[PDB]
């Protein structure tokens, strides 16, 4: 009963351990590149024109 929870946790921890982890600088560059790519496309980031905006 108690061993089954530890065995399931150990099996989950074993599966979660063996993974291809990468650097923060590499990952953060991908997030920064995505935000810069869709910077013009975003209505909220740079405020949209009143004609194109449906609510205005």
């Amino acid at each position: 009963a108690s061993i089954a929870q530890a065995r399931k946790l150990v099996e989950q921890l074993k599966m979660e351990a063996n993974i291809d982890r990468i650097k923060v600088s590499k990952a953060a560059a991908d997030l920064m590149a995505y935000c810069e790519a869709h910077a013009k496309e975003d209505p909220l980031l740079t405020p949209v024109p009143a004609s194109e905006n449906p609510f205005r």
Binding site: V10, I19, R21, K23, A27, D30, L31, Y34, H38
Partner: protein, 333 residues
Amino acid sequence: ELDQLRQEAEQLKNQIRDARKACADATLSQITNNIDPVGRIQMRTRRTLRGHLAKIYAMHWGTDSRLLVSASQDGKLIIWDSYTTNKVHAIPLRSSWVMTCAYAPSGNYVACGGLDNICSIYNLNVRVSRELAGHTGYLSCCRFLDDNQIVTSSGDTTCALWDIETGQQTTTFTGHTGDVMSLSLAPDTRLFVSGACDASAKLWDVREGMCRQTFTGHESDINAICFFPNGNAFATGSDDATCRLFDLRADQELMTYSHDNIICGITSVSFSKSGRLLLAGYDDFNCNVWDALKADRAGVLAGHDNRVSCLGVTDDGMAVATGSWDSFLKIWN
């Protein structure tokens, strides 16, 4: 046996912690210091959707970014029109309480649940299509994968994928310690995440049905969670009054958004179309608009009197709609 298993699990956690620290050469705050910030930008209140009696507990936009659904404690689930500020549907619920709501990407089915322990689906006359009854505890969050499939979290400590046509659980996601509060699907709809009461998010696999990796940045219970537009990161609101960004590739906490004045926990979080702006709805009647990279509040939204419950940005990213316990949905632009 028990001690040996615990020692082996602790060694794996220590190896995991060492692997995350080895990857972390630089920080997100460091590399984005040179980047110019958003600045003093705050969206104006476009609409004020007045037609709820009790506290609104959840809301969700459609795919079109036209109609938005909103569930409330009145025992009423209203489908609004954002353009026309007008009622499209008003579905009377079976149970008066409702802690979650969803609206299909096809724009056909509408899901809801709460203390019933049932994810009641409604096909757009309106009536119950398939009452998804198979959870031990309260339904905390739910989101549509497709017109057929739908995923749910619960207070039973276990999320579960469903099939609307059959009316049964396809696969059960087990892993958390405390009650699961929120979930968020990826754009691909192949993987998803879920924050829980035990201060830990967990990345799942839809087809496989297994926990890929765990994230442990927060101290207090995670209330909300939301994916980053690309599908390689996510933010999480917690009871500790700190939003925390995480990377799926890096498998660690990238950045923490917080302030000393902000004492109360976060209720709901959502990114913009680009993912530069990270909005977050707090328990002090406000909703601060954080910059995801710069780690600073660009603006702040303060329309509601009572605490905001739900936060929903559109698919295209045209507008935001914050629901609240004041019983109002204020659309921002």
